[PDB]
Amino acid sequence: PRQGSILYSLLTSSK
Amino acid sequence: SPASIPHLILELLKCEPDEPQVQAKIMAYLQQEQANRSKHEKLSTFGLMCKMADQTLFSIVEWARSSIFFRELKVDDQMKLLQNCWSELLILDHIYRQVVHGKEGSIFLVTGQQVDYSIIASQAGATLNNLMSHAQELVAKLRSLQFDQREFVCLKFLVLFSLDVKNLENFQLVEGVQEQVNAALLDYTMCNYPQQTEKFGQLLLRLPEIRAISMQAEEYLYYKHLNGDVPYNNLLIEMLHAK
């Protein structure tokens, strides 16, 4: 797991 | 805008970002970052340009996440599509910016700033010079074709919704988007540029050139990063090392 993921953070903010 | 634009393209255009707003936001982050640094902690031009590319990529992801079709995919699928095409979208963004706002001999940046190609020619290494030589020629070809905003948004979707991506749950939606956008772009170009009987095919031919440029840009970033020239962790670097 890469909790540090900026891309994941950006995407989960819109779902 | 021409009198005649396909409904699908109208819907894609609605999803576009507000250019003047993106430009301001980026110019601010950048300034503050350089301020309050001692001589030996001041950012190099490379470091500043890296943060600029990073903030442009944030803007691209913000575009994608709220976009028609893309927003219907689960986060895991979205991650896979963006990891596949991130550098291609940055390159496409840069190239279209040159078509709209640029002039011969100079590079127009997302901040509204500009630098002459001749500066790069003298000062930069071989990797960046090759990169810039190819981008300059691609821009020149696109200016010749009269590349426009309708076509630009179609290419963005074709790059994003790539058929080369494996392990998608909803691979069907992706095929559907690729089919529909291809068809709308062909209708658009044939209608609005009828003297250019080959424009559709010529636009598609630019996609492999975009891919080639974004790969050499990745190589360039990679070597700079491992040389210690990248200031801190950022989205650019994350995407570079992924997959």
Ligand SMILES: CCCCCCCCCCCCCCCC(=O)OC[C@@H](COP(=O)(O)O[C@H]1[C@H](O)[C@@H](OP(=O)(O)O)[C@H](OP(=O)(O)O)[C@@H](OP(=O)(O)O)[C@H]1O)OC(=O)CCCCCCCCCCCCCCC
């Ligand atoms: C990603 C979206 C597209 C947006 C791109 C738009 C941004 C481009 C406009 C910026 C131009 C502004 C600065 C122009 C001034 C500049 O050209 O001069 C500084 C030169 C220094 O030249 P180089 O960066 O080429 O460094 C050279 C080079 O590494 C040599 O290696 P190679 O010849 O093998 O390539 C190296 O030689 P050695 O291996 O022999 O040591 C050389 O080392 P040395 O000096 O010791 O000989 C090394 O210097 O430029 C720098 O300041 C950085 C250039 C500005 C950054 C340009 C674009 C940065 C964007 C963010 C990174 C790209 C990410 C891409 C993601 C798709």
